[PDB]
């Protein structure tokens, strides 16, 4: 779980169709997103949210939930928030969020 492995793994999966992947792999991609969110400073979370909304064509009325996910992944301890996301969100929502994030994460300034 090095910086190099994280980036290579994110590059690989950013470009995959994950609509039909296995739950075990989808769960691991959620962990990947959580770890990668923690490579951004708090100061960049608003930009990460805005870039996510723009990429996904989401209205500003969806800013608050998108930002909350990034904030709470960033502050997560013991994977508690991450585990809640997995439990409480539907599969389609997890897929959409994960693909979005993996495609923006390497393109944005992290500090």
């Amino acid at each position: 779980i090095t910086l190099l492995t994280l980036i290579k793994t994110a590059e690989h999966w950013a470009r995959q169709d994950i609509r039909t992947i296995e739950d075990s792999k989808l769960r691991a991609l959620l962990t990947l997103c959580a770890v990668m969110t923690r490579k951004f400073s708090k100061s960049q979370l608003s930009l990460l949210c805005e870039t996510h909304l723009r990429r996904e064509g989401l209205g500003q009325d969806q800013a608050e939930p998108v930002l909350e996910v990034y904030q709470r992944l960033h502050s997560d301890k013991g994977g508690s928030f991450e585990a809640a996301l997995w439990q409480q969100w539907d599969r389609q929502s997890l897929i959409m969020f994960i693909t979005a994030f993996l495609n923006i994460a390497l393109q944005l300034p992290c500090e």
Binding site: Q62, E64, P65, E68, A84, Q87, W89, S93, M96
Partner: peptide, 12 residues
């Protein structure tokens, strides 16, 4: 004690 995620984004 329970952890609650926000509602998922709504795509129109």
């Amino acid at each position: 004690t329970p952890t609650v995620a926000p509602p998922a984004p709504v795509y129109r």
